[PDB]
Write a structure and sequence with these properties.
Organism (chain E): Tetrahymena thermophila (strain SB210)
Radius of gyration of chain B: 19 Å
Largest interface: A-E, 28 and 28 residues
PDB class: electron transport
Keywords (chain E): Membrane, Transmembrane, Transmembrane helix
Number of helices of chain I: 2
Chains: A mainly alpha (102), B mainly alpha (42), C mainly alpha (57), D alpha+beta (279), E mainly alpha (75), F mainly alpha (217), G mainly alpha (61), H mainly alpha (58), I mainly alpha (44), J mainly alpha (198), K mainly alpha (102)
Bound molecules: ubiquinone-10, iron/sulfur cluster, FE2/S2 (inorganic) cluster
Helix content of chain B: 40-55%
Distance between the termini of chain B: 65 Å
Shape of chain B: rod-shaped
Radius of gyration of chain I: 13 Å
Structural class of chain B: mainly alpha
Order of helices and strands of chain B: H
Protein name (chain K): Diphthamide synthesis protein
Largest sheet of chain B: none
Number of strands of chain B: 0
Shape of chain I: elongated
Structural class of chain I: mainly alpha
Oligomer: part of a larger assembly
Protein name (chain E): Transmembrane protein, putative
Largest sheet of chain I: none
Amino acid sequence: NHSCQKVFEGFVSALYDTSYFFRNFGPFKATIHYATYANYLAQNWAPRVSYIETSTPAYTLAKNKYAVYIVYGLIGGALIHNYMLDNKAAQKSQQYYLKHRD
Amino acid sequence: PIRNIQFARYHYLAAVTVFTYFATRCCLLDYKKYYPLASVKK
Amino acid sequence: MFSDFNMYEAKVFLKAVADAQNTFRQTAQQENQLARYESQSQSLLNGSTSGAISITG
Amino acid sequence: SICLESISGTIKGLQKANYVVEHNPNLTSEEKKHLKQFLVYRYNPADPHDQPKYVSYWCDIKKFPPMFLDAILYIKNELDPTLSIRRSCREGICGSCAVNCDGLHTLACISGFNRDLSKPTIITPLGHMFILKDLVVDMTNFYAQYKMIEPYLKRKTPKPDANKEYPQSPEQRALLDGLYECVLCAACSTSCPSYWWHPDRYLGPAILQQAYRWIVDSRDEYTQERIERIAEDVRLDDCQQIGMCSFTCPKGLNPQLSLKNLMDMVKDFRQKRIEQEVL
Amino acid sequence: ARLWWTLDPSKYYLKQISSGGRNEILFTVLGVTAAYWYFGNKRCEHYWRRQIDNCQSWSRAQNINGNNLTVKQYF
Amino acid sequence: VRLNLKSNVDQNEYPFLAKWDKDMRQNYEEYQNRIDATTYHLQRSQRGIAVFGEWMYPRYFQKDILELEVLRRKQQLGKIYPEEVSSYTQINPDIANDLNLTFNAKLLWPVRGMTVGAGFFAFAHLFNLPYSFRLGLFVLPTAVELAFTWGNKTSQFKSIEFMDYLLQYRVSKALLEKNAKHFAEKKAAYQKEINSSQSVQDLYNQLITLVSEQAPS
Amino acid sequence: MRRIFWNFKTAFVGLPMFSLAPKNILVYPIVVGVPLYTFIVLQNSVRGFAYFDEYDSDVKE
Amino acid sequence: RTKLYNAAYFLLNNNESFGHSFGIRLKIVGLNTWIVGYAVSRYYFSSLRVKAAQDERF
Amino acid sequence: MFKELIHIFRTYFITFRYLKKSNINFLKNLSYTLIAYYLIINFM
Amino acid sequence: MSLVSLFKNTFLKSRVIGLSFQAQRVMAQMAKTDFENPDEHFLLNDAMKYNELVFYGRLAENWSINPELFGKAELAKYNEAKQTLIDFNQYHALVQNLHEFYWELKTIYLELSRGVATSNFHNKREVTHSIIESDIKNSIHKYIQLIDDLKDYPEWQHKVREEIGYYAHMIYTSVNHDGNFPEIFKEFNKVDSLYYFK
Amino acid sequence: SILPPLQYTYSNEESLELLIHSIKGNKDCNSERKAFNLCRSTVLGKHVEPEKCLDKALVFVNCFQKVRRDESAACQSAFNSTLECGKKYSSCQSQLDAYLNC
Ligand SMILES: COC1=C(OC)C(=O)C(C/C=C(/C)CC/C=C(\C)CC/C=C(\C)CC/C=C(/C)CC/C=C(/C)CC/C=C(/C)CC/C=C(/C)CC/C=C(/C)CC/C=C(\C)CCC=C(C)C)=C(C)C1=O
Ligand code: SF4
Ligand code: FES
C-alpha cells in the first residue's frame, strides 16, 4: 500500500501478540484446556438412548436393554404426576379459598 | 447393530418438528390480516 | 359447555357488569374524595389559624 | 490506497463490458461469405496489451477434413500462425487437444464442427483452468492430482512363481476394463461442477476414476489403503452424481458410474471398519 | 452424493461408554428431580394467589431521588 | 363505539379536558380497528385444535395479549404530549426512548450502528480493505443496532406503566379544572396563611401521626 | 478490462436458468405449502369465520 | 500478472444432466429458504411497533 | 442438516473456506447447544 | 483417611495408562490426515481417544503422583506412559505448527483465488500488489527451510512437500511469469517445482 | 405466575348460575347494556365524570337483577334443569336453548 503499511503490520502484530498472551497465559491456558475437555465431554458423551451394541446379547447388560423403557416410564410418570398434582392443587386452592371466603 | 434405532429416528423427527413449530410458528398464525375479510356477529 | 357464541355473550355481559360496579365505585369514591379534601383543607387551615400547629415548609 | 480506484474500475469494468460480452475482432475484411465462421478464443498473457480477444476467421470447410483440430491447424498454419494448441496424436488417443468445441469439452481431433455455414462455431480453451495461451490451459493442477492417488501397482505380498505372471483371469480383467482407457484429457473434470468450485480439495472425475481402476485392479492388494486415501475430506465426497462427467467423455467411459461405485465402497468402508474391527 | 436425509443417528455420536450404555438413567433421574423442583414452585405460586384492593395496598410514589412524586397541574 | 369525532366539552372553561377528549375521539377509530383485529386473532387462535390453538392458548399467544393491552391503554389516551413525558423521567429515565421503541412515533434510524460502521469505514480506508468488506462492516453494526432496537418488548411494559401513570395524571388534572372555580376562595386563604408547597394530602397525614404519637390521650 | 465471455441464451447460466429456477424453487412451497396452510387456516372455521363482535360496535352515539 | 480463466458454465451448452441435478438442488434449497424465510418474516412482522396518534411525538 | 449446510457454504462461498473444520466443529457444538436451549426454554 | 489422595492417584494412573495404550493409533491416524485440519476424522469419523488423550497428556505432564501407592512395576509402567504422553504432546505441537504454516500458505492462495473468481466484481486487479508478493517470497523461503530441517526424517519431508508444497504449486499456477516472478519463486524453482510437473 | 390472579372465589354452582343469567341478560337486557357501554366509552363518562353514567348503570344493573331473579316458574324450572346439566358436566346446548326461549 503506502506508509500506512507499517501501521497495518503493527496493528496485526499487536493483535497476534495479545491473542497469544491470552491463550497461553498460565491460568487462562489451564482454564481454556479444561473448558475444551468439558465441551468435548458434553457434546460427544451426551445422555443418548441409541448406541452401537457391539457386544453379543449374552453380554449386553439388562440395564441397557431396558434403559429406553426406564427413561420413557420416568418421563411419562413425571408428566402425568405433574398433571395430577396440578389438578389436586387447583381443587385444594378452590376449596381453601371457599372455606376462607366466608 | 444399533440399539433403539426406531427410537432414535422418532426422537430426531420429533425434535425437528418441534423446532420448526416453535421457530416458525407455522401452526400458530395471526389472523389480523383475515379480520377485514370477515362477517361479524351481534 | 355451550356454543362459543353464547360463551362470548357471557364474556361481554360480564365485562359490562364489572364496568357497572366500577362505575358505582368511581362515583362514590370521587364524591367522597371531594368531601375528604375539603375537610382536610379546612382542618389544616383551622389548626394553623388557632395557633395549634406551626407549618414550616 | 489502491482500493477505491480498483473497486470503481472493476464495477465500471464489467458493467461497461457486460454489454460487449463478445469482442469479436475480425482477422481481415471480407464481403462474400461462402465460408464457415470460426470464433477462436485468443489470449497471450505475455504482452501487457492483450485481453480475451475472440477472433472471427472465415475459411472454406472443404479444404480441410471435418475435424476441429484440422480446422484449427488450417487456421494456425495459413491464416494466423500465432495461434497455439496442444496436439500430438491426431487420433484421439493422447488427450492433448481437449478444448471447448462449441460449448462442449471434447477432444478436438475426434470431433466434427457443424456444417451449417450460417451459424458460427466457437472454439474456446478447456474452461475452468488458467489460460497459458490461446486454447492452451495449464493442466498441471490436474497432473499433480494424478500423482496423489498413487497410480502404480502396489503389492503387499509376493508370488511364489517368481518367474511367471500374476494370475488375473479374463473375468477379473473385465472389472478394470472400461476404466483404464482414459487418456487423461481432463474434459470431464473441466465440465464437472464439483470440480469447478473445489479444484483444490476435489480430485476430479478422471482422477477418481483412475483411483477406482487401481482399486478394482485384481492384482493390487492395497484396496483399503487407497479407499482411505480417497475417502478423506471432500476428495471424493464432493461429487454430486450430476452425470456430466460421463456425458462428455470422448472415449465413452463412465466416470459417473465409477465415482458412484467408489462412493458405495467408501460408505461400506466406514461401516466395514466397525463390523470387521470389533473383537 | 445426492441423498443425505435420513433419520438414523450419526455413527460419530453412537459410541458407548466402557462401563455400560450411555449415562441416560442417571441423567433422566437428575432431570426428573429438577423438573419436580421447578414445576413444583410455579404450581405453588399459580394456585395460591389472590388480588385485593383495600386502599391500604397503595403507598406514596417516590422519584429516583427518594422524595415524593408530585406533578404540578401546569408542570 | 362509533364515537363521533366532535367533542361536547366546553373548550373555553376546561381546555385541557376538551383537548384530551378531542384527542381521544380523533384516534378512536384506528385503535378500535386494531383492537378488533387483535381480538379476532385471539378468538380464532382459541378456536384451533390441539397444537394449532386451544392448547397453546393463552400461554403462547403472549405477544398479542400485550398488544391488546397496549392498544386499549393507548386508546384511552388519544395522544401523548412531550410535556407529560418528561414528568415520568422523574420515575424512569429514557421513557421517551421506550415510547419511541414501542409506539411508531418516528423512524428509528440506527445512528449508533451507522456511526460504528463509519468507524469501520475509516479503518478500512486506512489499511485498505475491499469495498465489499466496507459495505459488509457497515451493514453489520447497523444490523446489530436494528436487532437490539426492534423486538424490545420490555419497552412495551415500561410504556404500559407510563400510560397508566399518565391516565391517572390526566384524570386527576381533569378534576382540578372542574373544581378550580369552587376552590378559588379557599385557595387564597390557605396559601396566604400556610407557607408550604407540601400537598394537603401529605401535610394531613403528618398531622394524623403527630396527634397519634403526642396528644393528651 | 473485465472482458466477460458468456454465451447468452445458450448456456446453463442464462435464459435456461431463468426458465429453470422458478419452477424448481417453487416446488415445496406449492406442493406442501398450500395444502398445509389451507388445513391450518380452515381447521379453525369448523363452524364459521365469523368474528364474535365484542366491544359492541353495534352502538352509535 | 494473473491468469484469467473462463467460467466454463457461461460457455457450456445446457444439458439435461445439469438441468436435473440443479433442479433437485434448487428444490431443496427453495424448501429450506422458504422455511427460514417464513421464520424470519414471522420474527420481523411480530417485532413491529404499535400504531401512534396522528401527531404523537416524544 | 448441519453437515450439508456447511458443505453448501464451503462449496459456493470462497471466503467460507477460510474457516478450518476446527472452527466449523465449534460452530456445530454451539449450534447444538443453542438448539437444545431453545427447545428446553420454549416449554418453560 | 487419605481417600482424596488415593482416588486422585488411581484416577490419574488409570487414565494415563489407558490413554498410553491407545496413543500410537491416534498419532498414526493424525499422520494420515492432511495438514489442513489434522484433527479431522476425530471431529467427524471417530474421536477414538483424541481429546481425552490431549487433556490427560497435559494433566500427566503437569500433575504429580504419590509413589507410595504405586508398585515397582506400576511405577515403571506409569513413567513410561507419562513419557509416551509427553511425546504425544510434542508431536501434537509439531503437527499444529505445521498445520498453521499450511494455513498460512492456504490464506495466500485464497487471497489470490478471490481475485480471480467470476463472482469477484468487487475488486479485479490485473497485477498482484507488493505485499502479497513479499508474503509469497517469505513463505516460500520458510517452506524451503522447513524442508531442509526435515532432512533427517524422509517420510515427514515427503509429507510436508506433498501437502504444504501443493498450495505453493497452486500459487505458482495462479500467477503469470511476469515481473518479479523469477525472483519470487527462485527458491521454489529448484527442486519442489519439478515435483509438481514444472 | 403469568395468568391473572382471581379476585372473587366463585363456586361451581355460582359460576354456572352467573353464566346462565348473563346469557339470559344479554339476550334480554341487550339494549340497556349497549346504552350503558355507550355512556362508558368516552373519557368523560369512563374516567372524569362517572356521575353521568349513574342512571344508565342503575338501569342495566336493575335489568340484570330482574334476570337473576327469574320470577317465572317456567324460567325457574328450565334454569334448574340447565344448572343440573352443567353440574353433571363438572352438550347442554339444547337445554340452554330451551331455557332461553322463556
Ligand atoms: C449438484 O448441484 C449442482 C451444483 O452444486 C454443486 C452446481 O454448482 C452446478 C453448476 C451450475 C450452476 C449454475 C451453479 C451456479 C449457482 C449460482 C450462480 C447460484 C445463483 C443463481 C440462482 C440462485 C438462480 C437464479 C434465480 C433466482 C431467483 C436468484 C435471484 C435472481 C435475481 C434476478 C434477484 C431477484 C430479483 C429481484 C428484482 C430482487 C430485487 C431485490 C431488491 C432488494 C431490489 C429492491 C428494488 C427496489 C425498486 C427498492 C430499492 C430502490 C432504491 C434503493 C432506489 C434506487 C437508488 C439506488 C441508489 C439503488 C450444477 C449444474 C448442479 O447441478
Ligand atoms: S474420463 Fe474421458 S473425458 Fe475424463 S479425462 Fe478421461 S478420457 Fe477425458
Ligand atoms: S491430438 Fe491426441 S487427443 Fe487429439
